[PDB]
Amino acid sequence: KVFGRCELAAAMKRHGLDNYRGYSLGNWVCAAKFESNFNTQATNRNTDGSTDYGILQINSRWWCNDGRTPGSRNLCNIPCSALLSSDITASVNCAKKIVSDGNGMNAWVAWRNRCKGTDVQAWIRGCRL
Ligand SMILES: [Cl-]
Ligand SMILES: [Cl-]
Ligand code: NA
């Protein structure tokens, strides 16, 4: 699924991401924009042979099982394919674990390089939320 901006905002807010670990909704929408362009089916292969999945490009190196990242972990205890679903529940529940592991949203490189320190509230402006 390719979400609209406000559509995604509302889904994330419903799942409790707004202000989760102190990160306002616009941070999460900005991270999704630049990680996946709001597309739940986005996938991208990493240098080390792991793959990032879904709207928040969650990495198989640590967080999900894809069967093709030798030596990896599955800390969210899910198949990576669950992160491609039109229903973002699995991506949000796993992102809450990632953002809690110590480095907050710096876990997402696109958030650090394209959202951190910007007007992230622009990402939810206009939304009836
Ligand atoms: Cl915000
Ligand atoms: Cl933090
Ligand atoms: Na894995």
UniProtKB/Swiss-Prot annotation:
Enzyme active site: 35, 52
Gene Ontology molecular functions: beta-N-acetylglucosaminidase activity; identical protein binding; lysozyme activity
Main location: secreted
TM annotation in the entry: none
EC id: 3.2.1.17
Pfam annotation, one family: Lys
Disulfide partners: 6-127, 30-115, 64-80, 76-94
Compartments where located: Secreted
Catalysed conversion reaction: Hydrolysis of (1->4)-beta-linkages between N-acetylmuramic acid and N-acetyl-D-glucosamine residues in a peptidoglycan and between N-acetyl-D-glucosamine residues in chitodextrins
Every C-type lysozyme domain range: 1-129
Reported tissue expression: In the egg white and polymorphonuclear leukocytes.
PROSITE patterns, sorted: GLYCOSYL_HYDROL_F22_1 (PS00128), GLYCOSYL_HYDROL_F22_2 (PS51348)
Note: Lysozyme C is capable of both hydrolysis and transglycosylation; it also shows a slight esterase activity. It acts rapidly on both peptide-substituted and unsubstituted peptidoglycan, and slowly on chitin oligosaccharides.
Protein purpose: Lysozymes have primarily a bacteriolytic function; those in tissues and body fluids are associated with the monocyte-macrophage system and enhance the activity of immunoagents. Has bacteriolytic activity against M.luteus.
Homology family: Belongs to the glycosyl hydrolase 22 family.
Protein name in the entry: Lysozyme C
Originating organism: Gallus gallus
Organism classification: Eukaryota, Metazoa, Chordata, Craniata, Vertebrata
Gene name, Swiss-Prot/TrEMBL: LYZ
